[PDB]
């Protein structure tokens, strides 16, 4: 069983930068994002393939926010900027090896645009 | 107006998978069937291959894979116009059929010589077996198979006749269709 833990959140002032970390303990298929706000479902805001070479992101965060991994430990990223009063949201990362990442989610960590 | 036929597909597993099937009676797949394949992830995108006519009947599909690995799965919708008229899934890895070989010449002992139909990094590289066909031109009487598999496709070999070669592959490790056979080059 891989657990995943994301990091990185936190408060940042709206046009700025916000680059999130998500650790997980092996590597994956499927790695994907998902963020969720108050009464709003959790949508999948980036993803990437397993060899990947071919990034997936939300018509709402296109050009916006970047997904990758680094090397050796494997650690989902979500680094975004020029971040929107309206993605204030816990963003999750999951993880999968078949169709869409929802083997794991290990919770995730909440991302708040300033006024 | 039906398909007959359930669509079959074979993978390049670099770029391509061709696509063919068939339906009732003549039919201008270019001019009306739309075939829509899409992979399986979450922000995945939508691709429409314009078909053709393979016979009066049947039809045919080119399917553009930009990177596939082992672990891909597209649904392939036939439309017409508006009218469903098929849905299924393909994946790419279980039906692959290699690129031909190409660049074949020839340079005691003789030199055949060809390229690899795929560059290093892709995995049929690994695992490819080519088999060259040498039969005579003069004589067609007189033919040869030969087994290769070394990274460098070339072959060499040092028997008045005059000579044809065309050299074919496929990935062992993968369970490939044999590819077409490259262009037959010709000699003494
Ligand atoms: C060279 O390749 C040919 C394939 O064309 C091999 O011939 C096959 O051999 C297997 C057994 O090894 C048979 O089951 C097949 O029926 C044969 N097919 C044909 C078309 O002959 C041949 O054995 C190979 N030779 C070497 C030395 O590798
Ligand atoms: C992936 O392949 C499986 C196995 O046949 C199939 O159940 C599934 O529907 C396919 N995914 C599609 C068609 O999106």
Sequence with gaps: ?115 | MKVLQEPTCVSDYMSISTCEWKMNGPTNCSTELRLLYQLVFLLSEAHTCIPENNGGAGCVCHLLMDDVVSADNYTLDLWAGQQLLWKGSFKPSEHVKPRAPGNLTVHDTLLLTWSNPYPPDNYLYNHLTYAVNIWSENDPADFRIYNVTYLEPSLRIAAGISYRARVRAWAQAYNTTWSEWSPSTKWH
């Design chain 1, 1 to 115: 069983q891989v657990q995943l833990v994301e990091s990185g959140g936190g408060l940042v002032q709206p046009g700025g930068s916000l680059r999130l970390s998500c650790a997980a303990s092996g590597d994956f298929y499927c790695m994907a994002w998902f963020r969720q706000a108050p009464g709003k479902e959790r949508e999948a805001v980036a993803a990437i393939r397993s060899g990947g070479r071919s990034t997936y992101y939300a018509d709402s965060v296109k050009g916006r926010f970047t997904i990758s991994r680094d090397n050796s430990k494997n650690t989902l990223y979500l680094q975004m900027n020029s971040l929107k009063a309206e993605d204030t949201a816990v963003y999750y990362c999951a993880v999968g090896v078949d169709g869409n990442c929802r083997n794991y989610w290990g919770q995730g960590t909440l991302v708040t645009v300033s006024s």
